[PDB]
Amino acid sequence: GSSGSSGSLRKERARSAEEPWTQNQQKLLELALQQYPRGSSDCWDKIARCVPSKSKEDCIARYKLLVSGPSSG
């Protein structure tokens, strides 16, 4: 765009802001989503516990995709 310094942020692997989910994390979460269903902000706070890699906030940001995806049977 226009020659500017301050503004929005650009994606970059280096930053590693939104790291991927390993077979483990993806699992620890799923299994959790079952034990700690929707409810109070605390409900999730617990889900993040089973995930020593991702945090509560991340757990919720991942759920959207988990529920926003097709699944046969």
- Cβ–Cβ under 8 Å, residues 50 and 31: yes
Provide the H-helix boundaries in the chain. Answer: 23-35, 41-47, 56-67
Task: List the structure tokens of 4.
Answer: 């500017």
32 to each of 13, 63, 72, how far by Cα in Å? Answer: 28, 11, 21
Contacts of 33-37 spanning 24+ positions with Cβ under 8 A: 33/63, 33/66
Geometric angle at alpha carbon 11, from 61 and 29, rounded to 5°: 25
User: Total structural domains in the chain?
Assistant: 1
Nearest to 50 by CA among 35, 23, 36, 32: 32
Neighbours of 9 (CB within 10 A): 7
Three-class secondary structure of residue 8 per DSSP: coil
Residue 12: which domain range? 1-73
CA gap 65, 73 in Å, rounded: 18
